[PDB]
Scaffold this active site. Structure first.
Site, PDB file in Angstrom:
ATOM      1  N   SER A   1       0.843  -1.193   0.000  1.00 45.13           N
ATOM      2  CA  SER A   1       0.000   0.000   0.000  1.00 45.13           C
ATOM      3  C   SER A   1       0.879   1.243   0.000  1.00 45.13           C
ATOM      4  O   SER A   1       0.648   2.185  -0.760  1.00 45.13           O
ATOM      5  CB  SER A   1      -0.890   0.042   1.249  1.00 45.13           C
ATOM      6  N   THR A   2       1.885   1.227   0.869  1.00 42.11           N
ATOM      7  CA  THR A   2       2.821   2.338   1.037  1.00 42.11           C
ATOM      8  C   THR A   2       3.539   2.696  -0.253  1.00 42.11           C
ATOM      9  O   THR A   2       3.862   3.857  -0.487  1.00 42.11           O
ATOM     10  CB  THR A   2       3.870   1.996   2.127  1.00 42.11           C
TER      11      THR A   2
ATOM     12  N   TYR B   1      -1.030 -11.124   4.054  1.00 39.59           N
ATOM     13  CA  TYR B   1      -1.237  -9.717   4.374  1.00 39.59           C
ATOM     14  C   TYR B   1      -2.670  -9.410   4.814  1.00 39.59           C
ATOM     15  O   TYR B   1      -3.591  -9.368   3.992  1.00 39.59           O
ATOM     16  CB  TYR B   1      -0.841  -8.885   3.147  1.00 39.59           C
TER      17      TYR B   1
ATOM     18  N   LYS C   1       1.595 -10.535   8.110  1.00 35.46           N
ATOM     19  CA  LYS C   1       1.691  -9.096   8.342  1.00 35.46           C
ATOM     20  C   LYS C   1       0.336  -8.757   8.949  1.00 35.46           C
ATOM     21  O   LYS C   1      -0.662  -8.658   8.241  1.00 35.46           O
ATOM     22  CB  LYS C   1       1.878  -8.325   7.031  1.00 35.46           C
TER      23      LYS C   1
ATOM     24  N   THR D   1      -1.833  -6.248  10.116  1.00 32.14           N
ATOM     25  CA  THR D   1      -2.128  -4.823  10.156  1.00 32.14           C
ATOM     26  C   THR D   1      -3.512  -4.635  10.790  1.00 32.14           C
ATOM     27  O   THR D   1      -4.492  -4.296  10.126  1.00 32.14           O
ATOM     28  CB  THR D   1      -2.082  -4.207   8.747  1.00 32.14           C
TER      29      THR D   1
ATOM     30  N   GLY E   1       1.604  -4.529  12.352  1.00 34.32           N
ATOM     31  CA  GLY E   1       1.325  -3.654  11.226  1.00 34.32           C
ATOM     32  C   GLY E   1       1.039  -2.185  11.476  1.00 34.32           C
ATOM     33  O   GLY E   1       1.164  -1.374  10.554  1.00 34.32           O
TER      34      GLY E   1
ATOM     35  N   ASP F   1       2.315   0.968  13.229  1.00 36.04           N
ATOM     36  CA  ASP F   1       3.445   1.606  13.891  1.00 36.04           C
ATOM     37  C   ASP F   1       3.028   2.256  15.206  1.00 36.04           C
ATOM     38  O   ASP F   1       3.747   2.170  16.209  1.00 36.04           O
ATOM     39  CB  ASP F   1       4.071   2.683  12.984  1.00 36.04           C
ATOM     40  N   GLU F   2       1.860   2.892  15.202  1.00 32.93           N
ATOM     41  CA  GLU F   2       1.379   3.587  16.387  1.00 32.93           C
ATOM     42  C   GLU F   2       1.114   2.742  17.640  1.00 32.93           C
ATOM     43  O   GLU F   2       0.805   3.295  18.694  1.00 32.93           O
ATOM     44  CB  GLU F   2       0.139   4.427  16.044  1.00 32.93           C
TER      45      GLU F   2
ATOM     46  N   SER G   1       5.457   1.979   7.371  1.00 33.25           N
ATOM     47  CA  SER G   1       5.731   3.157   6.553  1.00 33.25           C
ATOM     48  C   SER G   1       6.685   4.144   7.221  1.00 33.25           C
ATOM     49  O   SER G   1       7.588   4.684   6.579  1.00 33.25           O
ATOM     50  CB  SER G   1       4.426   3.917   6.279  1.00 33.25           C
TER      51      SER G   1
END
Lengths: 295, 296, 293, 294
Positions: free
Chosen positions: C44-45, C134, C162, C164, C186, C188-189, C205
């Site tokens: 996606s990134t 994914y 993965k 997310t 997946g 980051d936050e 990302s």
């Protein structure tokens, strides 16, 4: 009529400055609806602010309404609560007061299995002691999402005589009618009444009927006579009002309109419901003017 | 009649051969089949044409062939929408080159785009359509894009927009849209509520099922126009019995299978990951095809 | 070994929206120099869904030329179409990637069985390269159950997941059911919380501009230094707060631009440009990050 | 002291007649105290408050105070859809000496954010000084709040805590970041460890009734930087939660408490149905496990 089919108003509950029941206003509202030629009344539902009333308070409203209209128009008592026991208690009272049927929203907040939902209805039908049950489907407010097979099972439970379909899904409306040709099927969303009947509903229960029920009766007749244009025009006028009610606040908007029609003394709703923004009064008052003149 | 887009138009399917490649002969047969059953026009390259599992050149090839087969006979709307604005622009210019009457584009999906970005996307495509009216395409169910009524009003009033394909079961919004835009060409997008959609305000429609029973929808329009509610309702019910089946079998592949038994499509497969139709459903599908041909 | 902290690579474009090869090469070297364990390419990134198949192959090939044999390389070959996904998987094998990955096919509704056959076919075309399942419901629209996720990660040829998703209860259930599974956090936050819940690594990302912070969180938690782990996650989140305001991919590209890594900070249309009102903050963040490392 | 810590969301034990079983109620309170719990959240979802009358809720609040006041912290969930009914319970909570009150965002009817804020202000008023614990639980309430709205609620005059029943650990971190001194209770037991790491400084949970010490252990382990220990405890808690989801949450907990000789009759009120008998073996064995382990 010897059946439950028709246009039924979901009754509002008039309160006074102290947020207590305004009996005098309640009676006037029941009489007002009768005068509008409504087929019946749906009492103690969401529209009656039943969920912010106690058991005895709801019970008091049922009794007053019965006194005022029992034998003049059909009366349906929404007795639903999250609790089965509480719902049964109200079912017994409704039977005692002489209502023509009971109804209950799918118990909410807590997640209940479909089997538990069925047993809930069965228990209430039992306490209803003979009065037919109107299954009440309204996922938007209840959060309970039922499949078609689950809805079919509910409408086929022993003692069930009707379904209040408060859903904007007209594909499902048609599927329900196709599966149950004789089922009394109430269109639950006023804003799509016309399209709802075309899809299979043979009547409806709505909060806005309180101020313009004759319009809905007019759409039923128009459709029966094959007058599409008239039906659409009536629906458009009803939606113009609905747009306003959504802006001003639904129940409080309706109570305010009824206030300017000299039916309700104090157009308040119970907290947490807030008051109508004074900036809307002109339109609401003007709407009352039109409605009365239209009569 | 010369240029108005109002009407009942079929969302064209894309016939493939045993190798998953475009079956030109069947595509041509399908176009004529739709023309023979009196459809007002064709919506080409939409979700139904499996555009999203096709390359740009493959979509252009379908557009060109459909154009050769039906330009002048019926209205032709080319769905040129892609997630990418640049790709959409390319398909738009080709649609104009092939002689289509209009273009359409689904709200770009997957990535979350702001409403302003959706508007610029449409403006860019309209530019490349160079004259062909744009049909805004609202379909939250598949796109995942939920537009407010105000946003929908902004989109349909963009310069160059001549219609809206309302693929929503919300008939309150349908009426609000009609009320806000009395002249707007408004297509009912969910076949299963067609009759109710028209009553709410839609003045026509675009759908996948029109390929096998378009005359029923035309009949519904006719019935409502003549105040024959019973006939309108009967027709909608029959359409829904079919839709009930398609949902069980798979929508596009179910339709292709029926067309196959109606001798229009040679091989009824959809492109992978779409699987084939479960054999247990063939008897009903064959019976339906038989029923439809006798009816037509 | 596929376990580790790997950056979801961005695809640099020029003023005319075409691939900017020089910046793509620069970005790959920038990641390597900052010590990333590997790169996830064409996801996606990477704006893969606004690229053609040949464009995606072009990116995979260049990245392999730049990083093959230096860091792990995972190629996201996912498309809605199985056949298109297979073509990319075979190209990934040709270029020498260490693994392939594919998002659950979207837009059109597909049965779980169809999703499984989708993955099998790709795994076959991958010709030996392990597959990274994914899972990203927020964007794909496909919401799998734990059971289905279990079936997918146990398919022959699947070597990682993965994840997310922000559901850390499910993250724990996956780890519990699969002790040896390579499980990439997946979002980051929530990286720190994701690791505690069971993930043994991550793909993200934001790793392009501050990957050392996530490496720092893996190190901190391993040493039982919760205090440092939180400070780092918190700083990562101050950055993410900004990206959500500016636009995610374009915000990262703008930062990398001010770091002289990316020549032009644009994403392809319909993505719009960054609102000039956010430039001061983005420039300030770039300066801060460069001084930090 | 303060309100930070591990608070068990108290269950409401009923007798064969679906009526309050005081004996079992008192036993559950003391059972929790013996586990080393920091306090009790009484009258919430877990206590089947929404299938109890106001009077029944007050009765529960009073008995618990009699058993625990001055021994552990006591928070009284007094939320109802009605503001006036919520206020009645708030005033009662003040009367019985509770440390704080709490209210779930009013549900069913769609209320504007302003009406929600005014709802909390009214209850706080009637609370007569007791701090308010805002209750965020979209899943059950259906009310979806934005971070900005959440910031407004926790900053309302009189609010002293937030019960965060959400799996969004990004938002958990954002809340802690925006309010460094806020008492923040993790609301989903199955992610307790991760919630603490994200910013929560404690929690309120149903499963604490049968294994509260494991959660206290997680707090200790994290505080002492023992990651593997915190993880193992969370895994143990989730093996339990996996089973409860299968059997039914509340009744599953009551059943376990039953085999622990705490609750006489492990039934919930209708429409809740009974536990499927095929699960008894697992529930009974779980009880034994917990008893020995304890």
């Amino acid at each position: 009529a010897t059946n439950l089919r028709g246009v039924m108003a979901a009754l509002l509950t008039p309160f006074d400055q102290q947020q207590a029941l305004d009996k005098a206003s309640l009676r006037r509202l029941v009489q007002f609806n009768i005068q509008q030629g409504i087929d019946g009344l749906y009492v103690g539902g969401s529209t009656g602010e039943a969920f912010v009333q106690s058991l005895s308070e709801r019970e008091q409203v049922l009794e007053i309404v019965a006194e005022e209209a029992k034998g003049k128009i059909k009366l349906i008592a929404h007795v639903g609560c999250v609790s089965t026991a509480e719902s049964q208690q109200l079912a017994a009272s409704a039977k005692r007061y002489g209502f023509d049927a009971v109804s209950a929203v799918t118990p909410f907040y807590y997640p209940f299995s479909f089997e538990e939902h069925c047993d809930h209805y069965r228990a209430i039908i039992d306490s209803a002691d003979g009065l037919p049950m109107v299954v009440y489907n309204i996922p938007a407010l209840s959060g309970v999402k039922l499949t078609l097979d689950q809805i079919n099972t509910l409408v086929t439970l022993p003692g069930v005589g009707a379904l209040k379909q408060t859903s904007g899904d007209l594909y499902q409306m048609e599927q329900i009618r196709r599966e149950h040709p004789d089922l009394v099927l109430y269109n639950g969303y006023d804003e799509i009444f016309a399209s709802g009947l075309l899809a299979g509903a043979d009547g409806g229960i709505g909060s806005t009927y309180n101020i313009m029920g004759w319009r809905y009766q007019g759409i039923v007749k128009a459709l029966k006579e094959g007058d599409i244009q008239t039906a659409q025009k009536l629906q458009t006028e009803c939606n113009k009002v609905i747009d306003l009610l959504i802006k001003t606040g639904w129940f409080r908007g309706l109570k305010t309109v009824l206030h300017y029609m000299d039916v309700v003394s104090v157009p308040l709703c119970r907290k947490p419901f807030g008051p109508v923004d004074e900036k809307y009064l002109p339109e609401l008052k003007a709407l009352a003017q039109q409605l009365m003149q239209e009569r």
